[PDB]
Scaffold this active site. Structure first.
Site, PDB file in Angstrom:
ATOM      1  N   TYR A  45      78.662  57.034 105.377  1.00  0.00           N
ATOM      2  CA  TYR A  45      78.188  58.265 104.978  1.00  0.00           C
ATOM      3  C   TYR A  45      78.549  58.714 103.563  1.00  0.00           C
ATOM      4  O   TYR A  45      79.783  58.413 102.857  1.00  0.00           O
ATOM      5  CB  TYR A  45      78.691  59.479 106.041  1.00  0.00           C
ATOM      6  CG  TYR A  45      80.077  59.738 105.602  1.00  0.00           C
ATOM      7  CD1 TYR A  45      80.454  60.691 105.281  1.00  0.00           C
ATOM      8  CD2 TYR A  45      81.061  58.925 106.623  1.00  0.00           C
ATOM      9  CE1 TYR A  45      81.877  60.987 105.192  1.00  0.00           C
ATOM     10  CE2 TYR A  45      82.360  59.216 106.562  1.00  0.00           C
ATOM     11  CZ  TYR A  45      82.708  60.298 105.697  1.00  0.00           C
ATOM     12  OH  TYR A  45      83.950  60.609 105.926  1.00  0.00           O
ATOM     13  N   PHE A  55      81.530  65.987  98.494  1.00  0.00           N
ATOM     14  CA  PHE A  55      82.956  65.894  98.930  1.00  0.00           C
ATOM     15  C   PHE A  55      83.366  64.709  99.498  1.00  0.00           C
ATOM     16  O   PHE A  55      84.636  64.908  99.850  1.00  0.00           O
ATOM     17  CB  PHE A  55      82.882  67.100  99.882  1.00  0.00           C
ATOM     18  CG  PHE A  55      82.049  67.207 101.223  1.00  0.00           C
ATOM     19  CD1 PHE A  55      82.396  66.618 102.278  1.00  0.00           C
ATOM     20  CD2 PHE A  55      80.751  67.742 101.136  1.00  0.00           C
ATOM     21  CE1 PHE A  55      81.624  66.412 103.627  1.00  0.00           C
ATOM     22  CE2 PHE A  55      80.114  67.527 102.337  1.00  0.00           C
ATOM     23  CZ  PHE A  55      80.356  66.961 103.312  1.00  0.00           C
ATOM     24  N   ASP A  56      82.694  63.894  99.948  1.00  0.00           N
ATOM     25  CA  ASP A  56      83.152  62.442 100.536  1.00  0.00           C
ATOM     26  C   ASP A  56      82.247  61.553 100.624  1.00  0.00           C
ATOM     27  O   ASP A  56      80.884  61.799 100.394  1.00  0.00           O
ATOM     28  CB  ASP A  56      83.667  62.741 102.053  1.00  0.00           C
ATOM     29  CG  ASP A  56      84.597  61.872 102.634  1.00  0.00           C
ATOM     30  OD1 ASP A  56      84.942  61.098 102.236  1.00  0.00           O
ATOM     31  OD2 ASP A  56      84.839  62.233 103.989  1.00  0.00           O
ATOM     32  N   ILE A  75      81.891  66.820 114.147  1.00  0.00           N
ATOM     33  CA  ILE A  75      81.012  68.049 114.072  1.00  0.00           C
ATOM     34  C   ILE A  75      79.687  67.720 114.989  1.00  0.00           C
ATOM     35  O   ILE A  75      79.079  66.626 115.056  1.00  0.00           O
ATOM     36  CB  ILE A  75      80.664  68.638 112.931  1.00  0.00           C
ATOM     37  CG1 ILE A  75      79.933  67.479 111.800  1.00  0.00           C
ATOM     38  CG2 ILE A  75      82.124  69.028 112.180  1.00  0.00           C
ATOM     39  CD1 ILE A  75      79.410  68.020 110.578  1.00  0.00           C
ATOM     40  N   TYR A 101      81.249  73.290 110.291  1.00  0.00           N
ATOM     41  CA  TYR A 101      82.636  73.641 110.330  1.00  0.00           C
ATOM     42  C   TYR A 101      82.718  75.327 110.288  1.00  0.00           C
ATOM     43  O   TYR A 101      83.752  75.987 110.432  1.00  0.00           O
ATOM     44  CB  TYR A 101      83.295  73.186 109.079  1.00  0.00           C
ATOM     45  CG  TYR A 101      83.744  71.745 108.955  1.00  0.00           C
ATOM     46  CD1 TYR A 101      84.619  71.410 110.023  1.00  0.00           C
ATOM     47  CD2 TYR A 101      82.780  70.946 108.309  1.00  0.00           C
ATOM     48  CE1 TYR A 101      84.660  69.768 109.672  1.00  0.00           C
ATOM     49  CE2 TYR A 101      82.885  69.658 108.420  1.00  0.00           C
ATOM     50  CZ  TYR A 101      83.713  68.799 109.278  1.00  0.00           C
ATOM     51  OH  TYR A 101      84.167  67.646 109.301  1.00  0.00           O
ATOM     52  N   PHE A 118      74.246  65.582 104.516  1.00  0.00           N
ATOM     53  CA  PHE A 118      74.845  64.093 104.726  1.00  0.00           C
ATOM     54  C   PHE A 118      73.615  63.045 104.637  1.00  0.00           C
ATOM     55  O   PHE A 118      72.592  63.095 105.052  1.00  0.00           O
ATOM     56  CB  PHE A 118      75.493  63.785 105.980  1.00  0.00           C
ATOM     57  CG  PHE A 118      76.713  64.522 106.419  1.00  0.00           C
ATOM     58  CD1 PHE A 118      78.005  63.985 105.766  1.00  0.00           C
ATOM     59  CD2 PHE A 118      76.574  65.782 106.837  1.00  0.00           C
ATOM     60  CE1 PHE A 118      79.142  64.826 106.162  1.00  0.00           C
ATOM     61  CE2 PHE A 118      77.917  66.672 107.231  1.00  0.00           C
ATOM     62  CZ  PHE A 118      79.279  65.894 106.710  1.00  0.00           C
TER      63      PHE A 118
END
Ligand code: FK5
Length: 128
Positions: A45, A55-56, A75, A101, A118
């Site tokens: 991902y 962010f990631d 999530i 979140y 994502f």
């Protein structure tokens, strides 16, 4: 770009029909089968905030993220979205905060009330 496109052109895959999780299939996977609840799923991902920041990424770690599907180990948007995927599929998911979140966020990467983007690749799924 891709976040706008899934926002404007994505498929609501929520059971409630509340547009909380929107999806576009970007790379068609294999055959017809999707994972079942409790399967061990292997994904890659990338995640982006609505301010454009990445962010990631699991790719950057050279290892997939592995979890058991449908157990709340991720999530809500991921349990819902990964369950719809075929092996080898790549999709885009847009996740409203109620499926992510919420007001809490996730310290330090995710602010309060964040809509998330994502790109997810379903590498494999296994019964255990
Ligand atoms: C606690 C020990 C650390 C433990 C960290 C790891 C195993 C490393 C693992 C690769 C996570 C990443 O670490 C690089 C990093 O992944 C993000 O960047 C990300 O892309 C993300 O959104 N992911 C990760 C991939 C699955 C979907 C989602 C998730 O569901 O993640 C889960 C998540 C944060 C759930 C919260 C948990 C609290 C509930 O209150 C809240 O309920 C709404 C939901 C992750 C997997 C947790 O179960 C486990 C952990 O957190 C988060 C933005 C922040 C997170 O680091 C913290």
């Amino acid at each position: 770009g891709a976040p706008a496109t899934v926002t404007e052109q994505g498929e609501d895959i929520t059971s409630k029909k509340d547009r909380g999780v929107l999806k576009i299939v970007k790379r068609v996977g294999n055959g017809e089968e999707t994972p079942m609840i409790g399967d061990k799923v292997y994904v890659h991902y990338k995640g982006k905030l609505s301010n454009g920041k990445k962010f990631d990424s699991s790719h950057d770690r050279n290892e997939p993220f592995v979890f058991s599907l449908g157990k709340g180990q991720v999530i809500k948007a991921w349990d819902i979205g990964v369950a719809t995927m075929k092996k080898g599929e790549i999709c885009h998911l847009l996740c409203k905060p109620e499926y992510a979140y919420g007001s809490a966020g996730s310290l330090p990467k995710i602010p309060s009330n964040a809509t998330l983007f994502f790109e997810i690749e379903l590498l494999d799924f296994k019964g255990e």
